[PDB]
Amino acid sequence: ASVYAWNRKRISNCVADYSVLYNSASFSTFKCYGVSPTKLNDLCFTNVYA
Amino acid sequence: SALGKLQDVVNQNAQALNTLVKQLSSNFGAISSVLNDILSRLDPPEAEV
Amino acid sequence: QCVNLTTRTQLPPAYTNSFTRGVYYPDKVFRSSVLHSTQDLFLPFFSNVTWFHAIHVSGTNGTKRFDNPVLPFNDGVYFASTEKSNIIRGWIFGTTLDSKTQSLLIVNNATNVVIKVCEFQFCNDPFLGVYYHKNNKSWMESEFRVYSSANNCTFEYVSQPFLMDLEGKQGNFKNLREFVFKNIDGYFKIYSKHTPINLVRDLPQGFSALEPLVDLPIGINITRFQTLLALHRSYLTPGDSSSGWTAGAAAYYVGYLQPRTFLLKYNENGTITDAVDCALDPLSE
Amino acid sequence: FQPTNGVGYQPYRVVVLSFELLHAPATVCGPKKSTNLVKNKCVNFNFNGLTGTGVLTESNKKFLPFQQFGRDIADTTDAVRDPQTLEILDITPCSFGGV
Numbered sequence: 001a002s003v004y005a006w007n008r009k010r011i012s013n014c015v016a017d018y019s020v021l022y023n024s025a026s027f028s029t030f031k032c033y034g035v036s037p038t039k040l041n042d043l044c045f046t047n048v049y050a
Numbered sequence: 051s052a053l054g055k056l057q058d059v060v061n062q063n064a065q066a067l068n069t070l071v072k073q074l075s076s077n078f079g080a081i082s083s084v085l086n087d088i089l090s091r092l093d094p095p096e097a098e099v
Numbered sequence: 100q101c102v103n104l105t106t107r108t109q110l111p112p113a114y115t116n117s118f119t120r121g122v123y124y125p126d127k128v129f130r131s132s133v134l135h136s137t138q139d140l141f142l143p144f145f146s147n148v149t150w151f152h153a154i155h156v157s158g159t160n161g162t163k164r165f166d167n168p169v170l171p172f173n174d175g176v177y178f179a180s181t182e183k184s185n186i187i188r189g190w191i192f193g194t195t196l197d198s199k200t201q202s203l204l205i206v207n208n209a210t211n212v213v214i215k216v217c218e219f220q221f222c223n224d225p226f227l228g229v230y231y232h233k234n235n236k237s238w239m240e241s242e243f244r245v246y247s248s249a250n251n252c253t254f255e256y257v258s259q260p261f262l263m264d265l266e267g268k269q270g271n272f273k274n275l276r277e278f279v280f281k282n283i284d285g286y287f288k289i290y291s292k293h294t295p296i297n298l299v300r301d302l303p304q305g306f307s308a309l310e311p312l313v314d315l316p317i318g319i320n321i322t323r324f325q326t327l328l329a330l331h332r333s334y335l336t337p338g339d340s341s342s343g344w345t346a347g348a349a350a351y352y353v354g355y356l357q358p359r360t361f362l363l364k365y366n367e368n369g370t371i372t373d374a375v376d377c378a379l380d381p382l383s384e
Numbered sequence: 385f386q387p388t389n390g391v392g393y394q395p396y397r398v399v400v401l402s403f404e405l406l407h408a409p410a411t412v413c414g415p416k417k418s419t420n421l422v423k424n425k426c427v428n429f430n431f432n433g434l435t436g437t438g439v440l441t442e443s444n445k446k447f448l449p450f451q452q453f454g455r456d457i458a459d460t461t462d463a464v465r466d467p468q469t470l471e472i473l474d475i476t477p478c479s480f481g482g483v
């Protein structure tokens with residue numbers, strides 16, 4: 001999408017496997033803000049916006 | 051219905067055993083009846099209480 | 100596509116008695132030959148429920164009995180419909196139905212079931228549309244004027260497509276579908292049971308144990324619902340979208356659950372074969 | 385986006401993944417791990433939230449397609465179905481008594 005027309009990707013009812021994001025070699029920034037990326041495998045949420 | 055007392059004794063024993071077993075799922079004024087959940091999801095003092 | 104239908108007179112509805120029905124499995128615990136006594140929401144035995152009529156006969160002098168009122172939802176609804184041409188084809192469970200609060204839309208249209216949870220602007224008389232043809236003789240679902248607008252939705256659900264009968268067969272009813280709708284702790288658990296029937300009048304006697312079907316975690320405050328029927332608009336009745344619609348022949352029963360103790364009787368395999376209540380009479384107590 | 389500028393005038397596809405908690409029950413979460421099926425031994429088991437200690441024999445109690453647990457006239461855990469494979473087990477404590 002564009003900068004002024006950012007499209008959301010609200011998705012739920014799944015099994016989020018976060019072990020594929022930080023275990024990759026194709027990104028440049030992974031500065032999470034107080035979410036404990038290595039501890040995301042034991043925290044449940046309702047909706048994940050993208 | 052001839053051996054009434056012999057059956058009544060066994061029935062009373064079975065009822066006593068069933069009551070003794072069922073007396074384990076009571077709160078007795080506590081939060082819950084399961085001890086591990088009490089000692090895990092509560093502070094040490096109240097858990098011991 | 101809202102349209103206020105006309106040519107529908109008024110008549111006080113009847114009340115049919117429920118003969119020992121409304122017993123479901125409270126939990127998923129296996130018990131063999133155990134006379135367990137549980138306490139949960141059930142339907143009191145020998146209690147009469149509201150009988151909604153939906154028929155269109157030549158003897159009716161333009162009555163066109165097509166009932167679908169907005170019924171309340173206190174604790175549960177023992178929905179039981181004796182249909183023969185698939186008239187009851189979904190529900191519009193909601194809270195306000197004025198495009199302000201979400202509403203659980205469970206409708207099984209021609210393709211499949213779509214359990215959608217969104218904010219919709221429902222009309223004053225929601226229904227489905229099936230048009231009959233005189234050239235190829237094929238019933239096709241065309242009108243779907245349930246809602247009028249959408250908004251930001253929530254968790255939904257779909258299924259694989261299939262095809263139903265969709266034919267106006269003549270004779271007595273041959274199907275019976277029971278349902279129990281409870282909503283506690285943000286869990287809208289739904290029970291279901293399909294048993295054959297060969298009766299043409301009020302709900303017969305018997306006993307059946309309803310099994311859990313779905314447990315969609317919607318988390319809403321549904322307190323008032325309504326039914327989704329279907330008409331039989333064909334070449335016989337002429338007119339427009341407001342007049343000239345058929346009603347077929349069907350009937351659905353609606354009950355209300357109340358908290359009361361029940362005594363269940365599990366068989367040697369795990370199915371409930373009989374039960375008794377705890378306040379119908381001194382012998383029951 | 386001319387392919388002749390520096391390293392400060394290039395496209396950067398950024399993701400804004402966020403997390404929040406509503407009042408509805410959680411439906412999306414992380415994965416879970418599973419161990420091996422060690423039967424015929426007094427061990428500790430935790431299938432879906434229940435605890436206990438005892439051997440896990442292979443009984444013949446046929447459960448219903450929707451039922452998961454199993455009890456008796458004493459209202460105690462006696463048989464729990466395995467989550468992975470549809471095999472009904474049986475929970476009985478090991479040997480205990482006086483000497």
Ligand SMILES: *[C@@H]1O[C@H](CO)[C@@H](O)[C@H](O)[C@H]1NC(C)=O
Nearest residue numbers: 100101102103104222223224
């Ligand atoms: C049906 O009637 C109600 C109230 O009489 C009205 O608010 C509504 O707009 C009507 N529907 C249509 C399609 O005009």
Ligand SMILES: *[C@@H]1O[C@H](CO)[C@@H](O)[C@H](O)[C@H]1NC(C)=O
Nearest residue numbers: 113114115116146147148149
């Ligand atoms: C039917 O139910 C209604 C409840 O509104 C009440 O009149 C009574 O309990 C029943 N009456 C008859 C005639 O069965």
Ligand SMILES: *[C@@H]1O[C@H](CO)[C@@H](O)[C@H](O)[C@H]1NC(C)=O
Nearest residue numbers: 208209210211213240241243
């Ligand atoms: C039935 O509903 C599904 C889901 O919205 C839709 O794709 C399909 O076109 C519908 N079928 C008819 C006949 O309206």
Ligand SMILES: *[C@@H]1O[C@H](CO)[C@@H](O)[C@H](O)[C@H]1NC(C)=O
Nearest residue numbers: 231232233234235236237239
């Ligand atoms: C059946 O006839 C109706 C009447 O025009 C037509 O609309 C429909 O497409 C026909 N269907 C088939 C499968 O021929």
Ligand SMILES: *[C@@H]1O[C@H](CO)[C@@H](O)[C@H](O)[C@H]1NC(C)=O
Nearest residue numbers: 200201218250251252253406
């Ligand atoms: C949907 O939109 C309404 C109004 O914009 C808002 O109040 C609500 O929080 C949104 N999300 C929902 C209903 O999940």
Ligand SMILES: *[C@@H]1O[C@H](CO)[C@@H](O)[C@H](O)[C@H]1NC(C)=O
Nearest residue numbers: 365366367368369370372446
């Ligand atoms: C219980 O299950 C067994 C095993 O199939 C069967 O033989 C028996 O008839 C069942 N009991 C019923 C259906 O009452």
Ligand SMILES: *[C@@H]1O[C@H](CO)[C@@H](O)[C@H](O)[C@H]1NC(C)=O
Nearest residue numbers: 418465466467468469470471
């Ligand atoms: C889980 O996977 C194993 C093999 O990886 C398979 O044997 C088992 O049937 C699977 N469970 C389900 C419920 O499909």
